[PDB]
Amino acid sequence: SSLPVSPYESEPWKYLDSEEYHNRYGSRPVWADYRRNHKGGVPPQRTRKTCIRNNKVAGNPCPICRDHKLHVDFRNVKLLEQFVCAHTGIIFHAPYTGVCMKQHKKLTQAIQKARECGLLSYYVPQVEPRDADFGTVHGAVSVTPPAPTLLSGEPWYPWYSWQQPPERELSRLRRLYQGNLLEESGPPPESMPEMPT
Amino acid sequence: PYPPLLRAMILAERQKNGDTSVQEPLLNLERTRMRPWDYPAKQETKGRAKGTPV
Amino acid sequence: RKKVRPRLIAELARRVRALREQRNQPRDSQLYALDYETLTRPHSGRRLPVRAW
Amino acid sequence: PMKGRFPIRRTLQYLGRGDVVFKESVKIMTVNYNTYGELGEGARKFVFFNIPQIQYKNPWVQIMMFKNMTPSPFLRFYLDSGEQVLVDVETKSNKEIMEHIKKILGKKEETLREEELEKQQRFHPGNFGPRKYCLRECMCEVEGQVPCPGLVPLPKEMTGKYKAALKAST
Amino acid sequence: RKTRHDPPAKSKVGRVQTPPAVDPAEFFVLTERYRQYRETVRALRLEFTLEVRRKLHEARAGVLAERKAQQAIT
Amino acid sequence: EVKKPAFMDEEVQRILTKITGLDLQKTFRPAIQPLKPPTYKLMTQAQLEEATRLAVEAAKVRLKMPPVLEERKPINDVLAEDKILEGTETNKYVFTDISYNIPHRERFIVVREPSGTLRKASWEERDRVIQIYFPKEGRRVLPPVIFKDENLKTMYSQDRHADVLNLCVAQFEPDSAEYIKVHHQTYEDIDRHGKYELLRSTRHFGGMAWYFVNKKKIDGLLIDQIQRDLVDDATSLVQLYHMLHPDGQSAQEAKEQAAEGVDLIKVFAKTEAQRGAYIELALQTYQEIVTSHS
Amino acid sequence: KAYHGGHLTIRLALGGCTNRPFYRIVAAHNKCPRDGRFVEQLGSYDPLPNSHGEKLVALNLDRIRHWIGCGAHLSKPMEKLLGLSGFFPLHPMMITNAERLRRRRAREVLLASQKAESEAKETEAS
RNA sequence: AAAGGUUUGGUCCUGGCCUUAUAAUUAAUUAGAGGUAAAAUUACACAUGCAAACCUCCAUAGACCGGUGUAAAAUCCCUUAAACAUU
Ligand code: FES
Ligand SMILES: [K+]
Ligand SMILES: [K+]
Ligand SMILES: [Mg+2]
Ligand SMILES: [Mg+2]
Ligand SMILES: [Mg+2]
Ligand SMILES: [Mg+2]
Ligand SMILES: [Zn+2]
């Protein structure tokens, strides 16, 4: 239950410049000398879900998992570049490098975060401006003349406000619905009452 | 008056087309006035119940 | 196609049914009869709404 | 190896290279050509190379070809008005024949572009629906909008299961 | 949902209508709002009905429509 | 009043294009994208020269400069104030007209606030919703995080100024404050570090020189153009400076002496140059090298 | 299905997942299923506030005007949406419900003051 | 398919079978919780409950929604015409 502790956890980029990295890997990618063990000639379309379960390591740990000092961080661009095509800039699928699905998702997120912060370069296409015309004189983006009701402060339509019914009409309804009536309601509050708290 | 958004779309189109005016768009309600709900309806076009007893 | 075949029974049924409706048309005295004790129409059993009682 | 001579004629790219799109008046195009001779070489090449391209862009036009019925090759178009347009293609290259018929009875580039835009009037990018018809199936796909509960669990307070429990507690 | 040929339930034979009670002041105010609202919406539906027919006629027999027809024949 | 020259003036576009330059190898540098097998054609010297001409025609369309506009003015217009709806809603409604054939700057996008006010959507709200319903390739609904000063400084360290600007054109509108902010930050970084070569043979060179002329700091660009043996460009830059600042002491001095060619640059050094002493030294050194060698 | 009778209507078609509702504004024959065959999609409504706290409605106001001009009815939720936008007048029940909510909060505020006054009597008792 | 194994004393050719990839159902063994999607042996027989009302009487609706894949090479696409139990 004791996984080894890497000295480069704080600064992962340091490992890839150290002599220890050069001796083990040289100038080749960290996945160059890895082969997957599988039945048949056509391999499964996904790699194993994960190489490490509860501090235990699988039989043939993947390039990332086999070396604990290797750290998948958006800041460790030199490691991330090994998992991106230099010519097309497409991130390799997991079977290509043989990394487990857990580390591939972690690598993809680190690559995407590195690109968004500008640490890792990518190709920016040249795109034309959205609009052919850049005028701002249409009413939609300009000032509409204020409506007469808006200047006076009245409701847009008169029936928006409560207009007291005539007394004769209130009696006409009390006769029509005699025996099934509710208490008469007066004018509603002028504004919304502040919520009690 | 016209509804608030539909009024602004009318005034905006005026300015775009070069029509300069401060006239307020107005809806005409005379052509489309509704009868009361209890107004007698057309009996000739009304249905009759069927002759199968329940 | 040409394997679609006539449906005589359906043709006979439609006409016969329509004829019976014309022969046995009900009258207003029957369709709109009412039992005032229950306020329900005997022809159809429809109970009138409460606001009409 | 694809069978036949010039198997490129049996590719969708070649069939789509045709540029002669007839006007709606054109209904029939009869091709009278001779299989032997020297002045009818362009006509024979036109039947070999160009007739497939013309039919591909004009599926509703009847192209019927007759062989060795007359001394010289010609094209006769039958229009919907009842007019008959005779073309004489003797001593004319297959490329020349295509350009001639394009000029007299071919739709212009402007007309074809207008039809394409009108065809796509009812596709809107903002519209949501299946991938076959729309870019996005649901608003959860849009950035900043509430994500799909399947991918990302919703907050408990936004769930009917939780809301029902509180109402019982009340 | 049931068809007209289905038998009615035996738990709802007793059912009778309970009409809602009516507030005189609010019922009248609401009845007037519906009449005035529905008149405004009928005026707008007519304005929209006219733009549809105007746009249709311009396309069918507008200035541009007539010129293109003759231009093609020429 | 003599009209102030504009960015799109045919005279300004001529001068800005010339100083920008062209380089078919830089303009058509290979893109890091999914690749296809190359094609091959056997061509004579005439055919090859024709193909090179078409390449220069395409490089012109590729180098079309993006618009330089003034900052838009905040939209603050209230269509209505329906107070009956106060307190009946907790969240704002944003309504967008998505009729296909309306220009985006002529669409009506309104907001119904919880207080009941019906107002027009602000510029930031307009751009967000137009991306949600008319999505543009390259643009994201929410502003990316690369445009933060710390992130932008990283791109500048990597000499990726043409990328910072290509991203600023894909995401922001030319008249937006964010667009103007990033451009003026990139142009200022190029000046301080003398990295004018990064934007040559690119569509972003014109806006950079335009910005320097208006801000009266063409000294660095002249010193760099002279040291690269591009002294016809330096003269054209001094002409553009004498065109947008006609009443400047330098422009009036060149009329008095009818200066032309290298004379124009010498006039600028004495009259209005912030660092005139260096412009003469670099200009003199260029003359010595040209005269001594040839 | 082969419908007989009915009219075109503009209504909201429910999409999304559980606890994540999303609506498509569509023009459809009234007898069709809620999420089934439609004639045209006229916009969308997302009833859940987004990151900016904004409920997003999209209206194809050119096509909406076309279908109202051809007899298309409107569902009551869609009549409410057009009223909030400003394209239609506020619906009668939108105003009535806002008045009922005002009268209902006035009672609550008054009761709280009465309770506070009753609590004040408790304070007087000490 | 980027292929592989397998006829012979041996080699080459021809040719089939099978392996490796992907998915659904069932079964054996095994298994924590959470979010989401889906739910399906059978047009065989069905206990019981519910699934269509509304409404000042007339009418309107129950012709929909929902279900199954019965029948039929049954269809697609397109043209013309006229209607609707409609708006
Ligand atoms: S698919 Fe959009 S909420 Fe689930
Ligand atoms: K074999
Ligand atoms: K053998
Ligand atoms: Mg009635
Ligand atoms: Mg099972
Ligand atoms: Mg169904
Ligand atoms: Mg069968
Ligand atoms: Zn691993």
Residue numbers in the entry:
A (entry chain O): 42 to 238
B (entry chain 0): 165 to 218
C (entry chain 0): 3 to 55
D (entry chain T): 2 to 171
E (entry chain U): 27 to 100
F (entry chain R): 63 to 356
G (entry chain M): 10 to 135
Tell me what the authors wrote about this structure, in their words:
Mitoribosomes are essential for the synthesis and maintenance of bioenergetic proteins. Here we use cryo-electron microscopy to determine a series of the small mitoribosomal subunit (SSU) intermediates in complex with auxiliary factors, revealing a sequential assembly mechanism. In this study, we determined sequential cryo-electron microscopy (cryo-EM) structures of stable assembly intermediates and initiation complexes at 2.8–3.2 Å resolution that involve six factors: RBFA, TFB1M, METTL15, mtIF3, mS37 and mtIF2. In conclusion, the model for the SSU progression through the assembly pathway includes a sequence of binding factors as an integrated network, with RBFA serving as a regulator through its allosteric control mechanism, which was not reported in a bacterial counterpart.
Comparison of our pre-SSU-1 and pre-SSU-2 (3.1 Å resolution) structures shows that TFB1M is missing in the latter, whereas rRNA is more ordered. In addition, the N-terminal helix of mS38 is inserted into the rRNA groove, adopting its mostly mature conformation. The association of RBFA leads to a vertical displacement of uS7m in the head by approximately 12 Å up, and the entire head is rotated approximately 10° towards the A site, compared to the mature SSU, thereby exposing the P site region. Such an arrangement of RBFA occupies a position on the SSU, which is incompatible with mS37, and mitochondrial C-terminal extension (CTE) has a specific role by stretching over 60 Å through the entire mRNA channel to block its entry. Thus, RBFA prepares pre-SSU-2 for a subsequent accommodation of the next assembly factor, and also prevents a premature association of mRNA and mS37.
